[PDB]
Amino acid sequence: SDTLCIGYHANNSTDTVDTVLEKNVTVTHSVNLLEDKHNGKLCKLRGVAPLHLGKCNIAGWILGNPECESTASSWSYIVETPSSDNGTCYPGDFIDYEELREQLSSV
Amino acid sequence: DIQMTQSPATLSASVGDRVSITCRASQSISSWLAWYQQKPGKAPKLLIYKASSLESGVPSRFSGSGSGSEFTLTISSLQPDDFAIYYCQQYNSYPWTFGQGTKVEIKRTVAAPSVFIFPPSDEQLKSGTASVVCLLNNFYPREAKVQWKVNALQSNSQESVTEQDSKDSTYSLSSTLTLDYEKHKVYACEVTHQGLSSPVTKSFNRG
Amino acid sequence: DCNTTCQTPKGAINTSLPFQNIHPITIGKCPKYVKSTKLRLATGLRNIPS
Amino acid sequence: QVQLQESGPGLVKPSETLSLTCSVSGASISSYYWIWIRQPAKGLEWIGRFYTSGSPNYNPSLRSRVTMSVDTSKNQFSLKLTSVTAADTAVYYCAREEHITFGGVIVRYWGQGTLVTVSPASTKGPSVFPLAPTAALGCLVKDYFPEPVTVSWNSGALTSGVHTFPAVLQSSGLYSLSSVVTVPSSSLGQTYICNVNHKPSNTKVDKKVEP
Amino acid sequence: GAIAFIEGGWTGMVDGWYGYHHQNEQGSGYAADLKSTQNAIDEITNKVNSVIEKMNTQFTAVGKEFNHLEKRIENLNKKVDDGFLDIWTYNAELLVLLENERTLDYHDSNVKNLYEKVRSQLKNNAKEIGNGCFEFYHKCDNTCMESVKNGTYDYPKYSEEAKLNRE
Amino acid sequence: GAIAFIEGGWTGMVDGWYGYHHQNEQGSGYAADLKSTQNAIDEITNKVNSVIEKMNTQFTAVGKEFNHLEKRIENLNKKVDDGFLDIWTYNAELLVLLENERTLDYHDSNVKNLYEKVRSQLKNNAKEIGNGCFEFYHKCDNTCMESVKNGTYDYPKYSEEAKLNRE
Amino acid sequence: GAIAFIEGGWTGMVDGWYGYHHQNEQGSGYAADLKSTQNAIDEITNKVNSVIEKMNTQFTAVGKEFNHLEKRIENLNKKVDDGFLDIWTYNAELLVLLENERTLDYHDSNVKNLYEKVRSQLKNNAKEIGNGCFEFYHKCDNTCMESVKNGTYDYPKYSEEAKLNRE
Ligand SMILES: *[C@@H]1O[C@H](CO)[C@@H](O[C@@H]2O[C@H](CO)[C@@H](O)[C@H](O)[C@H]2NC(C)=O)[C@H](O)[C@H]1NC(C)=O
Ligand SMILES: *[C@@H]1O[C@H](CO)[C@@H](O)[C@H](O)[C@H]1NC(C)=O
Secondary structure (H helix, E strand, C coil), rough: CCEEEEEEEECCCCCCCCCCCCCCEEECEEEEEEEECCCCCEEEEEEEECECCCCECHHHHCCCCCCCCCCCCCCEHHHHCCCCCEECCCCCCCCCHHHHHHHHCCC | CCCCCEEEEEEECCCCEEEEEEEEEEEECCCCCEEEECCCCCCCCCEEECCCEHHHHCCCCEEEEECCCEEEEEEEECHHHHCCCEEEECCCCCCCCCCCCCCEEECCCECEEEEEEEEECHHHHHHCCCCCEEEEEEEEECEEEEEECCEEEEECEEEEEECCCCCCCEEEEEEECCCCCCCEEEEEEEECCCCCCCCCEEEEECC | CCCEEEEEEEEEEECCEEEECEEEEEEECCCCCCCCCCEEEEEECCCCCC | CCCEEECCCEEEECCEEEEEEEEEEECCCCEEEEEEEEEEECCCCEEEEECCCCCCEEEECCCCEEEEEECCCCCCEEEEEECCHHHCEEEEEEEEEEECCCEEEEEEEECCEEEEEECCCEEEEEEEECCCCCEEEEEEEEEECCCCCCEECCCCCCCEEECCCCCCCCCCCCCCEEEEEEEECCCCCEEEEEEEEEEEHHHEEEECCCC | CCEEEECCCCCCCCCCCCEEEEEECCCCCECHHHHHHHHHHHHHHHHHHHHHCCCCCCCCHHHHHHCCHHHHHHHHHHHHHHHHHHHHHHHHHHHHHHHHHHHHHHHHHHHHHHHEEEEHHCCCCCCECCCCCECCCCCCCHHHHHHHHCCCCCCCHHHHHHHHHHH | CCCCEECCCCCCCCCCCCEECCCCCCEEEEEEEEHHHHHHHHHHHHHHHHHHHHCCCCCCCCCCCCCCCCHHHHHHHHHHHHHHHHHHHHHHHHHHHHHHHHHHHHHHHHHHHHHHHHHHHHHHCEECCCCEEEEECCCHHHHHHHHCCCCCCCCHHHHHHHHHHCC | CCCCCCCCCCCCCCCCHHHCEEEECCCEEEEEEEHHHHHHHHHHHHHHHHHHCCCCCEEECCCCCCCCCCCHHHHHHHHHHHHHHHHHHHHHHHHHHHHHHHHHHHHHHHHHHHHHHHHHHHHHHHHHCCCCEEECCCCCCCCHHHHHCCCCCHHHHHHHHHHHCCC
């Protein structure tokens, strides 16, 4: 009559993990090591806010393109938009544009 | 069986300060400690379990640290809603034991109390008791002197204080004078508070 | 007006975990980019309600 | 989310048993461990734990006078505390002990809390008087036993600027309290009524405040 | 091989990863073994925290910009990004696959050792009915049932009473 | 430690990785255990396929060309190729060394559990002669020999016949 | 779980990692088991030497120099140095954490198997008093004590003398 068993926990968990010997093993408890979600914002990096140029690109901002008449003492990084077109309104060659870009990116 | 010793017991910090509450266990308990926040007239809610795991739903201004015998709850930047008593609790062993708690009030700027005076109800007079009520509405800090005059001082009054206002960190204070009453004509309320230059006196004439 | 320690062109991320699949171009003290869809490290045991 | 509510006498005379009951909505009562916790108006103290299937565990400082049970037919669980004293006056909570996680076992969901007073004193019914008048006005909930009394304004509608004070014990051995509200002195033309309810005397009573 | 001679797990056992189910005159219930559970959780978190906290990253801005005449360093940059991508992806996948094997083995290992510690004490007083369960020949009350759990069970003082039912 | 108390392996056992050899009146032969073999192979392929299939590579042209005035990026390129070479070489060597240890342990583990499952049932009816073999006290025919293999062997119904030869 | 039912280790046992302590009429002493120790050391060195010798490095000059107009390749170079730093740091930490687990398990494994080999032979002639020790019912001299160590112990030829004290 009198009995005693040894056993282990089970629950409602549907979480599957993979092992090297076996795939789709349902487990009671698991953690995720993979970050798959983002806030959808451009935040302040190290408390310091980025420099957002709007419709301008660096060329446009630095030279003073007339469309770019709308800057902080420091910034953590620079933000352009894919449509950012206002740069060099008079045609010509910007010597070492990419280097100036890398060199202005954080101040 | 396992004593939980918490410190400090009271604490006043301004909006934005960092706050640190410390808990100690009489024997090693590894990381089997939780932190609760109990608001007034409420069940204590879970903030942090397993010493340093932030409850789903809970703001990241809360954080937990430690294992073994010493533990710490930090609020990196304090907000007015953080007014409550905070409890640590171990679940290493049976029985579960909690700390003696830590009451955290918010230190805001001085606000003077607007005073109101309230005569007894005629309905109450018909029953053979008379109550006079002084109200100090929305002020900080809590400390205040309320004196009753009949223009003679009284020794028969009781005071009651609200808990801190969870939105703008205020208090409210009522002073009851229980009394006999129809014998005198002038009833005043002398209110002394640090927010005021000179004491405020709200009174009334019976009738 | 959020703070982050890792920035991506489509969003910021929490740096709790070692790996991320959001974007390869990141700025900051970022988690290492990978092409996985799940990385699930089992803490509990095999769930067999018979 | 899962609801737990406490019910019980409120006032129970010395040396007697105290019974409490915890209704659970939103989860099965067969499928969880359940605990009781109290605190005197002093710190929190863990009473014990019960499971349908099943081995209870009670706090030694009380273990001899306490008993717990589950009622599957009504999804309720109960606490019995024999031979009560002054020390036993507390606010009692029921809570659900979660399934073991990587946490492992924690109290996540609690009950609203019920107050319990250990006195030979008789249940006394409150009397409610108006406090006639930006202007302030209110009610005086005077001469009752024991706590508590709910005080709403215009059937819970008027929330903003309401201040209900903690009751004070008067020399007679009874409770008194005031509930006041701050409203515009422009807006007195508007009817103001305070709803006072003291359940262990059945004193449901409403009072209009006028100048 | 203890998880899946003990086919299944107990949804009835709510307060631990490992434990016991008993039955006697006084009654029956699941009872978790906290000490084995506490260790397992303490060691497994240390494991999870090692995979995570060990990743101490350098401040990087991964992005770079080149012109129409710098296509080669462009592709050098891309080779750097893609080589690291491949290394991390591979390693992260395997690290998971391998530690997952060990975790599950560990859990199996603990159960096994729990069942083995019990079998070691009881010897002849009970019958191994399979399915992880011991069926007592003698009457084992809660107290007796307790001693087994905390490993202080006294074999001789039941064997003569168990010898009667053995025949 | 079951592979190399059982010194050697059986070239006679042709149809599985694990199994049994028997002897009775009716005759003697090797008989493989398919179910343990099938699992071992199914789990080990999953292992081999994880090391291989997980390697999802990016399209790369490793080659680059620089002139006589670009020696520095040349050496930067070479540093990239050689750093990845070193990482992969090291990791690949170890991955092999470590999984090879575990595989061989696994195989040892399975045998051990097979021998332990047999020893668990037979109890006193047979003598452990070392060398992995059980020598029966009683007569065990093919049917009896079968029940052991699929783990349904009935201990009591031979012990009195085995008790005679035990003395 | 053999290291920390055997709570502690013997500072008295000076000439091996694994061994025995005995006591009889003739006297008592620690005696190391060389063969298990020799293997453990031979296998563990092979392990240590694999982590080390497998690192076959390419000749590199890590340093590079760029001018005020080459800030981008500068940062590309730095990305290469820092990406490799991160990979190596992480891998080296884990490689240690994981092989350390296995080493310690191995050591536990060997002890367990030593204690199990002894328990397997002695059967009923001795009492398992816990704490890893066997208490003999009969008189076991040095010669008898030796046979156990090298696994040739003869069970029957003491059991009748041990049966007397068993009752
Ligand atoms: C600023 O940018 C805008 C759009 O990015 C330019 O507007 C375009 O200019 C071209 C070239 O003359 C026109 O053909 C299009 O009709 C314009 N598009 C729009 C949407 O207006 C604008 O010329 C730029 N201005 C300066 C000063 O650089
Ligand atoms: C981060 O931004 C917050 C505003 O959300 C600001 O208060 C703070 O100064 C910044 N830096 C911190 C918290 O280190």
